[PDB]
C-alpha cells in the first residue's frame, strides 16, 4: 500500500567461513537513488564535434568527435568495487585472501517515492513539494542483454560509495555509428590535414529503444522490484602478485666463491669464466653463457608500442597495453603507459568538502613486475661480437625515422607464442568488477578494465525513468516539447554481491606485505569535523606468489 514499506535497508558485509579454507563473502549495498525526470521524452541522435581542438596541428590525440543516441532513461550501475566494500573489508580481503571468485549478484528497488514541485507565482518566489500517489517509475531490466553494454565505472558514473549519502543514476546513451577520418600532423605542419566527419554507414546503423526491447514495469509508491539472482562464470582472480621476471626463472648459477664477511659490497663470484661455462642458450653461434643469454622456459611480459594511436572507421584510439611500466615503484614520476589513471569526483572518493571542478586523480602502480623498462632494451647484430660496435647495435638512444625523440622501442613488439602475462589487478574503490566478453569470433585473452570477464552473460543493465506526468493542455500534434508536471523520484536500491575466496597460507619464513593504518594515512579513513569523507585508493595484490 502507501504506508507499508516494501523492503529493508542493508549495507552489511558478511564473511561466512566454509570448509577447506574457503570464505563466502556477501557484500550488501543499499543506496537512496534520486532521479529527476528526463530533459525530453524523445530519443536524440547527437553528433559531438571538437573539430576546433583537433584543427590545431599536432593535437590529434585530443579527438572527441563521435555520434551517440541520447535516451530519456537513466542507468543504475553498481559495477564498481567502492559500492560494495569499505576500506576495512577490503583490508581483510587483501591481507587474508589469495584468490577471489565472483559467484552471484542480485538487486532490487523498494520504497519508491514520487514527488511534484509546485512553484507559486508569489512576487517572492516559493516552491512546495507535494506527493503524487499515482505517478509511476518505469523500471526496465535488460535480462536478455539486448542493449549496448555501457559500464559506468569508465566514466566514474556508478552509484556512490558512501552508504549515508544519496546517489544519482547516470543518463543513458550509446554510440551511434559514424565515419570519421583524421590524418595526423604536428606543430609546424603546413596546411590543414584531412580532418573530416563522413556521416554514417547505413549498413551499421543501429537504433535501440528500451520500450521495444525490454519489458517495462511501472512502480507506484507501494510497488517493489527485484531482478532475481544471476550467477557468474568468470575465471578466478588472484590476490597475489608475481615478481620473477625472466632473469629469476630456474636454477641460479653455482657460486664457486662465496663471500666471507658481512657487508653490502662483499659480493660472491661465480668463478668459471663466462665462455667456459655450462648450460643451454638459444645462441647457436656464441660460446658465452651469462644470466642475460641463458635459456629460460618462456618470456614473462611483452613489449608493445607505447603511446601508439591506431585509426579505423571511427578515428584514432590509443593502443592498450596489458602491463605497467618498469621501475615505477622507485620513481612515481616515471609512471607511464600501462598504468591506469583514474579520475573521479566527490561521489566516488574525492573529499566531499572540496570545491571546484577539478577532479581527484591517481595513477595505479601495479605491484606485479610484468612490465618492461624500454630504456634498458637493445638490439644487436646476429654475429654477437663483444664489445658491440656502434654499427652493430640499435639502442633506445638511436633515432628512428630521423626523429630524435622517437626510438625503436616506441614501435617494438615482442608478443609471441612464448609470452606469459597476468590479469589486471582490482582497483579499489573505482575499479570495475565485471565486464562483458566481446561477441567477436576470436575473443581477447584479457580485459584491461575488469578482473572478471563474462563468458556467457552477466546481469542486464537496470534502467529507471520518471513516467511523464502530463498537463491538461497536452496536444500530441504540437511540435513543441511536451508539457509535463515537474516530477522527481527517490527510491532505495539494494544489491547483494556474492564472492568466494581462499584464505592465504604462509609459505615462507619472512612476513609479507600488508595494508595497515599508520600515522601518515590515518585521517583518510575517518570523517573530518565538517563531515567530509574520502576513499583513497588501495592496492590489491600485496602477497607474492612464485611464478615458476
Amino acid at each position, epitope marked *: 500500500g502507501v504506508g507499508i514499506s516494501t523492503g529493508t535497508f542493508n549495507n552489511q558485509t558478511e564473511f561466512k567461513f566454509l570448509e577447506n579454507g574457503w570464505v563466502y563473502i556477501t557484500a550488501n549495498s543499499s543506496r537512496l537513488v534520486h532521479l529527476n525526470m528526463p530533459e525530453s521524452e524523445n530519443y536524440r541522435r547527437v553528433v559531438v564535434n571538437n573539430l576546433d581542438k583537433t*584543427a590545431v596541428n599536432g*593535437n590529434m590525440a585530443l579527438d572527441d568527435t563521435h555520434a551517440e543516441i541520447v535516451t530519456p532513461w537513466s542507468l543504475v550501475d553498481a559495477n564498481a568495487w567502492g559500492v560494495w566494500f569499505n576500506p576495512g573489508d577490503w583490508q581483510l580481503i587483501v591481507n587474508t585472501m589469495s584468490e577471489l571468485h565472483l559467484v552471484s549478484f542480485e538487486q532490487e528497488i523498494f520504497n519508491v517515492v514520487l514527488k511534484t514541485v509546485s512553484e507559486s507565482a508569489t512576487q517572492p518566489p516559493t516552491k512546495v513539494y507535494n506527493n503524487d500517489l499515482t505517478a509511476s517509475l518505469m523500471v526496465a531490466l535488460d535480462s536478455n542483454n539486448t542493449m549496448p553494454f555501457t559500464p559506468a565505472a569508465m566514466r566514474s558514473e556508478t552509484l556512490g560509495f558512501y552508504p549515508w549519502k544519496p546517489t544519482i543514476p547516470t543518463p543513458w546513451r550509446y554510440y551511434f555509428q559514424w565515419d570519421r577520418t583524421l590524418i595526423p600532423s604536428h606543430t609546424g605542419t603546413s596546411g*590543414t590535414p584531412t580532418n*573530416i566527419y563522413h556521416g554514417t554507414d547505413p549498413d551499421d546503423v543501429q537504433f535501440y529503444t528500451i520500450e521495444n526491447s525490454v519489458p517495462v514495469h511501472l512502480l507506484r509508491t507501494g510497488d517493489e522490484f527485484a531482478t532475481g539472482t544471476f550467477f557468474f562464470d568468470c575465471k578466478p582472480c588472484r590476490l597475489t602478485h608475481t615478481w620473477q621476471t625472466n632473469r629469476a626463472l630456474g636454477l641460479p648459477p653455482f657460486l664457486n666463491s662465496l663471500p666471507q664477511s658481512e657487508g653490502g659490497t662483499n659480493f660472491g663470484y661465480i668463478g668459471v669464466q663466462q665462455d667456459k661455462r655450462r648450460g643451454v642458450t638459444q645462441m647457436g653461434n656464441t660460446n658465452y653463457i651469462t644470466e642475460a643469454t641463458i635459456m629460460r622456459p618462456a618470456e614473462v611480459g611483452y613489449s608493445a608500442p607505447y603511446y601508439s594511436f591506431e585509426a579505423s572507421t571511427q578515428g584514432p584510439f590509443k593502443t592498450p597495453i596489458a602491463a605497467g611500466r618498469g621501475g615505477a615503484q622507485t620513481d612515481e614520476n616515471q609512471a607511464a603507459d600501462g598504468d591506469p589513471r583514474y579520475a573521479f569526483g566527490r561521489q566516488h572518493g574525492q573529499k566531499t568538502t572540496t570545491t571546484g571542478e577539478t577532479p581527484e586523480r591517481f595513477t595505479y602502480i601495479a605491484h606485479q613486475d610484468t612490465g618492461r623498462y624500454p630504456e634498458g632494451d637493445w638490439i644487436q647484430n646476429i654475429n654477437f661480437n663483444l664489445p658491440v660496435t656502434d654499427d652493430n647495435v640499435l639502442l633506445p638512444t638511436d633515432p628512428i625515422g630521423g626523429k630524435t625523440g622517437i626510438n625503436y622501442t616506441n614501435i617494438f613488439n615482442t608478443y609471441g607464442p612464448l609470452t606469459a602475462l597476468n590479469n589486471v589487478p582490482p582497483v579499489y574503490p573505482n575499479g570495475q568488477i565485471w565486464d562483458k566478453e566481446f561477441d567477436t569470433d576470436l575473443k581477447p585473452r584479457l580485459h584491461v578494465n575488469a578482473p572478471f570477464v563474462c563468458q556467457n552473460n552477466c546481469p542486464g543493465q537496470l534502467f529507471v525513468k520518471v513516467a511523464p506526468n502530463l498537463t491538461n493542455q497536452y496536444d500530441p500534434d504540437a511540435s513543441a516539447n511536451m508539457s509535463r508536471i515537474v516530477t522527481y523520484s527517490d527510491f532505495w536500491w539494494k544489491g547483494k554481491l556474492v564472492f568466494k575466496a581462499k584464505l592465504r597460507a604462509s609459505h615462507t619464513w619472512n612476513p609479507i606485505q600488508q595494508m595497515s593504518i599508520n600515522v601518515d594515512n590515518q585521517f583518510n579513513y575517518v570523517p573530518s569535523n565538517i563531515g567530509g569523507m574520502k576513499i583513497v585508493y588501495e592496492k590489491s595484490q600485496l602477497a607474492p606468489r612464485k611464478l615458476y
Partner: nanobody
Amino acid sequence: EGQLAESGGDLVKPGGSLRLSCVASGSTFRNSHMTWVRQAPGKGLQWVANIDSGAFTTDYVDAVRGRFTVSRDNARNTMYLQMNSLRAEDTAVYYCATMKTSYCIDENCFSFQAGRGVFDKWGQGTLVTVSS
C-alpha cells in the same frame, strides 16, 4: 543569440600600452577559435591575431609580432588583446570575431571537414587611436 562585445578602445599616447577586451555571450566561446581583426579608416580589413579554443597556439601578423599579445579566459568567458608598444599604425577599429573551424560538405551538412580562413560571427568593435 549571443554576440560579442569589444571594449577598451581609445586614443592613447604613442609608445604606451593598452588592453582591449572582447566579452563573449553564448556557450560556443569556450569551443571557438577567436580572432582579432583591425580596419584602418577607409582601408582594407587587416588580420591581427588568432588563438585556438584551448589556448594551445597563438598566431599574429608580422605588423603586430612581438607587440600584441592575445589571450583568453574561459572562466571569465572573455578574450583580451594586450597592445604593448603602441605605434602610429595601430590607429583603427578593432573587431573580435569567430573563425569557422568546421565546414559542412553536403548542403544539409551530413558531413563536415576542418578548414580555416572564414570568420563566422563578428563583434561590435572599438576605436583605437595613437597620438599625443
